[PDB]
Design a protein around this ligand. Structure first.
Ligand SMILES: [Cl-]
Ligand code: NA
Ligand code: NA
Length: 129
């Protein structure tokens, strides 16, 4: 399922992302846009066994388990398939685990590159009427 920009931003605000660990809402929409293009079903079969999953393109090497990434971790204790659900809640909760450990959103390359310097409050403008 591909979210509308404001559809997504609303949900991300209901999932408590607004300023979560120092990161305003537009940040989260900006990384979602530039990781998956708002599509909860986005995958990216990284060259080795690893695979980026869902709206925030979570990597199976570290966070979830697909059953195909030898000696990966599962730091969210979820199977990857759950990220592709079209609900963002699983993707959103594992992301909160990622931003606290201390990088934080730098953990997402698309955020690090396409969002860091931009004016990010623009990714949520016009979404209230
Ligand atoms: Cl913002
Ligand atoms: Na695995
Ligand atoms: Na979780």
């Amino acid at each position: 399922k591909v979210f509308g920009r404001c559809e997504l931003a609303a949900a991300m605000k209901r999932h408590g992302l607004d300023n979560y660990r120092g990161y305003s809402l537009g940040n989260w929409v900006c990384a979602a846009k530039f990781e998956s293009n708002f599509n909860t079903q986005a995958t990216n079969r990284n060259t080795d066994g690893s695979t980026d999953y869902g709206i925030l393109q979570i990597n199976s090497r570290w966070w979830c388990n697909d059953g195909r990434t030898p000696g990966s971790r599962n730091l969210c204790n979820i199977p990857c398939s759950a990220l592709l659900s079209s609900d963002i809640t699983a993707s959103v909760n594992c992301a909160k685990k990622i931003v606290s450990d201390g990088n934080g959103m730098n953990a997402w390359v698309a955020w690090r590159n396409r969002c860091k310097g931009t004016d990010v409050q623009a990714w949520i403008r016009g979404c209230r009427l």
